[PDB]
RNA sequence: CCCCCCCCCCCCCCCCCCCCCCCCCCCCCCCCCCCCCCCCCCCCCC
């Protein structure tokens, strides 16, 4: 029962409200408790509170006097209770309340008029209940009230009388989702007298009660309308007329196996700005079918379309000029789709679009010919993504015509190719470009020539081929900041690899074979691939089989942080390495064969971290190779993890794992 | 040049014979040297010489004086020497000599008489010569020569008097290899007193040359006749005809490209007893092509067939009853074939095989079903070769018809399937079965059930399944000697495993992961698959992934000799372990984590050894951990190799590589 | 001036074997989360 600005006493199985608490505590939480009761002469010790989060309990009923201890109270938080009796002196005395959550109450009915005379509740929440109407009162009260929820109820009707307590009242949320009801009553929202959000999830309208409802939320101010789950299967161009005459501008269609959409289906709706379409079941879609939408801003069609199936090959058709009138669309997420492919005019007339997402969008896109993208020639493309489209080769002027493309996402893909470098024309400001997860590919001495102000390249688990020729490709992206070369098995990396690259920061290097490029006893020397970078920041080096250090790699580090050397091979270190790195910050040496630390090596190393990984060491605990490292260990500030149960030594046996 | 008993001087670039060895020395070598003659008179000192190996050397002539210093020598050596002359006084008064090699000597003729004189020569030497004529004499001499030499010549003509001084000699072998005989003189042959084996590999006879040929080796004694590489590429009826009054027994038709046989053609030979066929290109068998061979007892057919080709797929094709004429057949090395198949009726006859080797004989032989063998019901095999086969599957009752089966090989198939138990039925007296190098075998508990006789199991990268079964399937092979279960990745083991087989001695373990079945942790604690077997003599269990040592596995194996446990991970271990080893020999402890050894562990291991193998470990230079090793390796006999390469010390790092 | 016979030394190519490092896939576990189901005990409501 740990308290000391808020009190919490979740999972501790109360009977009874503690006694002895600070009077001044403003939040009382007592979930998950079994508290048969509630008396309120145990509430004289609290009278500052401000929330009262007592919900999952077995509160039989309450009194009155609760309200007399809490005058200044807040929150009254009373989700899954057995509260099954409503009366006007229940919330009478509570005046002050802004917050009221009966979910899960089990309530039968209202009876006459429990909420009427109190006035600066906002939000009002009735889900989970048994109540069969809406009827909350029968004069006009809660004038402040804006949200109202009344999901998971058993109500089958909504009669006009029965809002005509909130007849001036604003609502910004009216939630009634999995109630089944079967009929409207003409002027029930009319009597609402600002209706602005409405929420239907989970309810089986269909077709022609849609269209009831929609001829009665005509002359509203409404929003918002989630029909999400309503098993609509098919909508036409009067499915939505009633919509007209408001300013409707999100819309909500998920989960309601929308199987075809009529022409001019959504021709009622010129303010519409948010419309969702995630998982449905759509076979075709027309090219007028979107007609009308020439407003919306933000488009989600995440699994919109139909699986294929070998019985039918019913593959998902989008015509031609479909996106046309979609002017000032700025957001098009189009994941997890079963479209064969892109045509030649797909996306013409998108002339605001900043963002197109295909991830997974098509089940066979094997090659990205250069007449792929030129119904995106006007637009202005920011961000691509192109992740899981099993694409298998990229041919010359495949982005040539996004002009002004940021960022390219070609991850989790099948490319199997040698990257040419005509790939890249024409995008003068590009700046990011991923390519993790790919076949294999096989860079040559200009791939990367034609774009200058490239910024990342993600090459994780792409196994590079030809990386290690003597012009490097690397080279002409004058401002790159963020490199991955991880997963890939490089075995040769040439001196002159990374020179001129002066703001590069990040680059991972982890899981290759770096082996020989190190030891002394290669040919030539050991490889000197670090050598420019004045700015690098975070080195990732682990499980690289590195067995010695030539001791001038890290020397033009000056503001390197984050190092790391796990599930490496090291065994002993030449001293003064880490000498320029004046601030590092994170350094990692797990799972090494290290069995000596000392300070002529590791010193400025340890000059002023944040966090030590050494945790798989076999160390020698010998007063010349632990000594020391025990010494700064002692008194020590850096967040160093698993101190005292993997740091063990190896030999000699006395030791034989006594940190 | 060293010499104790016998004397060598090869690949030290002699220029003149040393004149300071011991007198009695028996043996002179002097081969890759650069005497340009060799005089006599230094050879005043060695009086007591038998053998004259002076070979590889550029000598000019000789003179009759070394016989003199020389009067016991046996054996003169001259090969690839620059005696272009020889007369009767060059040999003349060496009388003793048994012994005489003319090799590559590019002697052009032979004068008057060089040979007469003497008469103890068993075997003659004139190989790589440049003789045109076998003309070495006008009388008979040689009376006790035995063995002829003259490949490599320009021999043009064998005429009948040219044999004449052999009138009166027997001739083991005559050896005319490689000389371009083009014609064959009547009675040449009958020249000869007694002529045993001929020679005439890469001589380009032919089918009518050789038909003379026959005619003219009538009625004579040979045994031996060599026509390898011949260029013969059709036999007949009448090839051999008069080989019919001789008593040949060994004729070789090996790399003569010999396309086709005809019907009857080896009717000639009731007496042959070998008859070699290795790398032929026989296309197509007939039935009575073999007949008349009814006393030939071993026959090698490696490569005799033509091979695939996908131009016309002319597989070799072997008639039914093809082997019935060779009633006392004992051997049929029958490999490296591409015969589509076997037949139903193939093997009938043959009621005294006693080997049959099939490695790589058929392209495609996938199943085997029960009536493969049908064929050998009477034939009394004892050894079967099935390498290299690809065969797929094996069904119930496929070697049911070997009844005295012994040794059964089927090492490197694509047998994937499950041993129902029911494959080796029938097999009453089997000894061996290997099944290495298969794809995957998944035993049942009474695999090996029904051949309890059984004594070998070769099992490496077979990669078996369900080896953990409650009852153990090798439990029935009541003589169990051999057992190789290296490769495999077994997992699991019960401790019933490997009772009752009390005289099991080798067992190979190498390679697998059985690192979970040792470690105390395991549940129901480390499995002792290794008690009962009182006569192991040879165990393999390295690379095991093994951490730690149950005390009491090696309790039982009172008798063992060779242990192997390389490329482990152990580290430390517990002592008196090896206690019941009083005998062991063959220590192999390489690439592990041991970093201490000392005396109450490995001290009755290290009792009487012969080979101890522990190249690869990270050892601790400490008085505690290796003072007892290296005083145990200062006075030592067992042979340890590469002790003074490999076996340094990993910490501390002031001994770090010191022996 | 030509053709051959060597001895010695230095390179190139192919094949085989062995060793080290690493990647990918798979197997045997062990651990931590997410979801579902079943069972036991206790406290209440209708």
Redesign the interface.
């Known amino acids: 029962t740990v308290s000391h600005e808020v009190a919490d006493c979740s999972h501790l199985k109360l009977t009874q409200v503690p006694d002895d608490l600070p009077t001044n505590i403003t939040v009382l939480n007592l979930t998950h408790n079994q508290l048969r009761r509630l008396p309120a002469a145990n509430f004289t010790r609290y009278s500052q509170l401000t929330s009262l989060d007592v919900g999952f309990n077995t509160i039989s009923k309450l009194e009155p006097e609760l309200c007399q201890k809490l005058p200044m109270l807040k929150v009254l938080n009373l989700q899954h209770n057995e509260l099954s009796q409503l009366s006007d002196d229940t919330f009478a005395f509570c005046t002050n309340l802004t917050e009221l959550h009966l979910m899960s109450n089990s309530i039968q009915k209202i009876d006459n008029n429990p909420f009427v005379d109190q006035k600066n509740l906002i939000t009002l929440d009735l889900s989970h209940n048994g109540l069969s109407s809406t009827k909350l009162g029968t004069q006009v009260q809660l004038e402040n009230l804006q949200e109202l929820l009344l999901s998971n109820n058993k109500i089958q009707a909504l009669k006009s009388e029965e809002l005509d307590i909130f007849a001036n009242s604003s609502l910004k949320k009216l939630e009634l989702s999995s109630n089944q009801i079967k009929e409207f009553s003409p002027g029930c929202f009319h009597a609402i007298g600002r209706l602005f959000g409405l929420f239907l999830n989970n309810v089986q309208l269909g077709p022609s009660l849609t269209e009831k409802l929609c001829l009665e939320l005509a002359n509203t101010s409404i929003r918002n309308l989630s029909l999400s789950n309503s098993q609509l299967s098919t909508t036409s161009n009067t499915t939505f007329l009633g919509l007209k005459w408001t300013n409707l501008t999100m819309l909500d269609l998920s989960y309601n196996n929308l199987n075809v959409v009529g022409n001019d289906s959504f021709a009622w709706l010129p303010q519409l700005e948010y419309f969702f379409l995630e998982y449905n079941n759509i076979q075709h879609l027309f090219s007028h079918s979107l007609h009308g939408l020439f407003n919306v801003r933000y488009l989600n069609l995440k699994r919109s379309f139909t699986k294929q199936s070998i019985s039918l090959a019913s593959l998902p058709k989008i015509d031609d000029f479909s996106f046309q009138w979609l002017k000032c669309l700025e957001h098009l997420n189009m994941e997890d789709n079963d479209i064969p492919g892109i045509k030649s005019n797909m996306f013409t007339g998108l002339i605001n679009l900043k963002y197109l997402s295909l991830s997974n969008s098509f089940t066979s896109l094997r090659t990205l010919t250069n007449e792929t993208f030129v119904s995106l020639a006007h637009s202005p493309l920011h961000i691509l993504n192109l992740t899981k489209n099993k694409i298998s080769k990229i041919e010359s002027d495949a982005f040539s015509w996004l002009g002004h493309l940021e960022v390219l996402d070609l991850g989790l893909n099948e490319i199997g190719q040698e990257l040419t470098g005509q790939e890249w024309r024409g995008l003068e400001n590009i700046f990011e470009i991923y390519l993790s997860y790919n076949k294999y590919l096989q860079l040559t001495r200009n791939s990367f020539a034609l774009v200058p102000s490239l910024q990342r390249l993600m090459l994780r688990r792409v196994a590079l081929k030809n990386v290690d020729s003597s012009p490097s490709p690397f080279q002409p992206l004058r401002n790159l900041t963020i490199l991955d070369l991880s997963n890939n098995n490089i075995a040769n990396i040439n001196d002159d690899m990374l020179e001129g690259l002066e703001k590069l920061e990040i680059l991972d290097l982890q899981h290759n074979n770096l082996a020989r490029l190190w030891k002394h006893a290669n040919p030539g020397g050991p490889i000197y691939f670090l050598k420019g970078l004045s700015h690098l920041h975070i080195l990732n080096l682990e499980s690289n089989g590195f067995d010695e250090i030539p001791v001038e790699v890290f020397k033009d580090l000056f503001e390197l942080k984050i190092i790391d050397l796990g599930l490496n091979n090291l065994?002993?270190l030449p001293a003064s390495v880490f000498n320029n790195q004046v601030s590092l910050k994170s350094l990692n040496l797990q799972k090494n064969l290290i069995?000596?630390v000392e300070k002529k090596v590791f010193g400025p190393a340890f000059r002023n971290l944040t966090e030590l990984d050494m945790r798989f060491n076999?160390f020698?605990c010998?007063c010349?190779?632990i000594a020391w490292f025990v010494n700064w260990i002692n008194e020590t500030h850096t967040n160093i993890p698993e101190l005292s149960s993997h740091y063990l030594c190896?030999?000699?046996?006395?030791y034989?794992g006594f940190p």
């Open positions: 065994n002993t069995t000596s076999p020698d010998t010349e190779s190896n030999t000699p046996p006395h034989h």
